[PDB]
Amino acid sequence: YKGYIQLALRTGQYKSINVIEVREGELLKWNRLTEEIELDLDNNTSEKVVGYCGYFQLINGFEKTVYWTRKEIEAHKQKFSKSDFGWKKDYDAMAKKTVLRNMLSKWGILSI
Amino acid sequence: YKGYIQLALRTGQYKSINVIEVREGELLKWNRLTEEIELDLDNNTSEKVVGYCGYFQLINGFEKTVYWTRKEIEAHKQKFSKSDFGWKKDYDAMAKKTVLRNMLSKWGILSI
Amino acid sequence: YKGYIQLALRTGQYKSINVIEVREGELLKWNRLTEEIELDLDNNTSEKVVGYCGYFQLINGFEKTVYWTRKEIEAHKQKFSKSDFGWKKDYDAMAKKTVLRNMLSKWGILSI
Amino acid sequence: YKGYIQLALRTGQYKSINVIEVREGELLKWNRLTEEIELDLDNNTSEKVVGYCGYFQLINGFEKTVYWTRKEIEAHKQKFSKSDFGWKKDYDAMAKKTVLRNMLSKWGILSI
Amino acid sequence: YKGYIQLALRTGQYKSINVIEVREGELLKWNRLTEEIELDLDNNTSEKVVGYCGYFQLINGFEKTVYWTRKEIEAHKQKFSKSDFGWKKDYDAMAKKTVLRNMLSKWGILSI
Amino acid sequence: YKGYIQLALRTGQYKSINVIEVREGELLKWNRLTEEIELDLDNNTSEKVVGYCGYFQLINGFEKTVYWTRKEIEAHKQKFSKSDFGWKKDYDAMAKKTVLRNMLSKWGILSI
Amino acid sequence: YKGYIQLALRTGQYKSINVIEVREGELLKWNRLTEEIELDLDNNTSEKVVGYCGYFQLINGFEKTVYWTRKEIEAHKQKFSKSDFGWKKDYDAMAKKTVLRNMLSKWGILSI
Amino acid sequence: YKGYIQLALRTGQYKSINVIEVREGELLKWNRLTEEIELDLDNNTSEKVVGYCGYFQLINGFEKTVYWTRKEIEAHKQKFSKSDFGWKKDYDAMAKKTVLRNMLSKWGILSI
């Protein structure tokens, strides 16, 4: 993936990129059609995360939002992944790296 | 198709683009004349997709919606497609790429 | 025609445009004076198209409907068209492109 | 005339406009006082047109009907028109353009 | 007068308006008290007009009829009009415009 | 008075209204009790008017007739009117407007 | 009283109503039993009114006549009326309005 | 009683109805068998009424006369009436209303 981030930095036409995790009872409602999402901070009771989100905006004003839950990531690990040694040590880091690599791959522009 | 996406990004006058899949018992009703579509989320029982949809809106306020079902895609694969090795591995990805290439081709503006 | 679509997009005062085909036993009744048309979906028995229709609405609320049958298109191809190589490969695409070019030409506004 | 259509489109308070030709044995009866007209379709025997008609309705519900025959148009061409090169090539297009320009002129509202 | 027509259109509570000319041997009998008028079409021999008429009906069902002859118009031109350059070019158009302006003025409702 | 006519039009329950002038040797006999009046047209010799009349009929069949002569109008101008600049320019128009305002006032129904 | 006239108009079953004043030396003889009254016009010498009369006839043929003199009206003003500011300005209008209100009240039919 | 008058008006087959009071030294002679009554007007000296009378005639020519004196009305008030507050304010109005109600009741035809 580090090659993908290297190419993204060498491209030099992006403005901002961010990936975060949304924990139980944090957001209000998400739309899968118009990409409408709203979130309220410091109002929560649990300590277990429920999903992941990512926001990427370019210098020309174009923006993109992606949101995933546990069902898709478990389906992906059970049909594509073939390693399990790192899954016991941590649960989120490899999920984040997969999210980044896919979002950079199928939408992101690459330059050499 | 990646050339088409490259040209679309280099054009730099679009605002948002999205392509999704609509699964059984998700939308309410679709109009083929006025492009009127409404969808209700998290209310569904099955696990088999039934159609595909796409929404593309420009920076000037112009928007366009496209919706396809299985009949048109199977007709297209039986009259135009000549390869079948990838159809057994996955069923949706190539359908999505065909949808994108056609929608970019016959409506989308291109620049060099 | 692609120049006409390019000029239409560069104009930037339209709201929605659509062109479709009406197949046998689909619509109910059409008025050629008040442009009154009503259509009932998923109630049909045949597989042969009978006409073409187009709806174009602007951002100011103005709308326009056009509907053509096979008689006018065959008269047009027999008095104006001088090529026949593409007519055997497909039957509808060039009819649609002629409909678009005429409707953009004699009503549509153009800007440079 | 194209300037008149441009001003009409830039006005942005109209709803629908249409101009057609009525051919022999098509309509039933026309009233010149109350603007009462009724027409029956697909019941005709000849192939020679006999008159022209136009219907224009605004967004506020106001509507207007105009109907002309060959006598008025021949009187107009013999007292006002000074050119004849285009009359041999076609017979109806310039009659339609005169109908549009007059109806837009003496009733239609114009804005700058 | 065009200002009067502009105000009438901007009012937006009228239904139909018409002004015509009645030529010799066209109508049957007219009543100046109950506004009873009846006319028979395509039964006439002369080619010289004898009077003018106007019918104006609102959206609420109210209707009004006005009919004038040559005596009143010649009295009006000889006591009020002060120009004669346009009278030789045409005879009816200015009579019609005076009829419209008076009927809009003394009965018609105006809004700003 | 124009406000009175505006209110009358906005009321929307009237059927017909008319005000005319009766000139010397025109009517036959008038009744002030049963409102019986009969008039014969195109049989007259003089050119000086002698009285004014008005007929107003509603949509429910109710009708009303009013007839005035010069004595009442001269008494009214000498006891109520305080202006004389317009009396020399014309003699009938202000008499008609007074007739309309009084008849609308003391019988006519008003709505807001 | 205007409410009484409003209710009378909204009733919509009357045919004609009239109230007049009879001046000295105008009528011939009046009967208080059979309501027989006869009057001769344009034969009079004085200029002082002596009484008031009213005729009201329905659509079904029923008619009613009422006639009053100065004695009854002065008795009524001295036993019922409590205001005198308007009596000096005019003498007849309030007498007429009292006649109308009483005749509408004790005979007239009212509807809501 | 107003209900009785309402029903009488809704019946719509009457022609004339009248009720009056006969004062001392007014009539000549009355017959209780053949209903023969004759009265001479404007020949009287007193100012105290002595009786009441009523005449009612239909559209078919049928007529009826009723005449009452003070003896019958005082007998009726002393055997039937149970209220006395209104008798001091006026003496005749309630007598008239009783006459009307009885005459409408025992002879008059009623319809619903």
Numbering used by the authors:
A (entry chain J), B (entry chain I), C (entry chain H), D (entry chain G), E (entry chain F), F (entry chain E), ...: 110 to 221
Copy text verbatim from the article accompanying this structure deposition.
The structure confirms that the RecT/Redβ family of annealing proteins share a common core fold with RAD52.
To determine if there is a similar structural transition for LiRecT, we prepared a complex of it with just one 83-mer ssDNA and obtained a ~5 Å resolution cryo-EM reconstruction by single particle analysis. Surprisingly, the LiRecT-ssDNA complex also exists as left-handed helical filaments, instead of as rings, but they are not as well ordered, and they do not stack end-to-end. Due to the lower resolution of this reconstruction, we could not fit the ssDNA to the map, although there is strong density for DNA in the groove above α2 and α3. Strikingly, the density for the portion of each LiRecT subunit at the upper rim of the filament is almost completely absent in the structure with ssDNA, for the entire length of the filament. Moreover, cryo-EM images collected for LiRecT protein without DNA reveal smaller particles that are much less well ordered, suggesting that the filament is assembled on the ssDNA (a full data set without DNA was not collected).
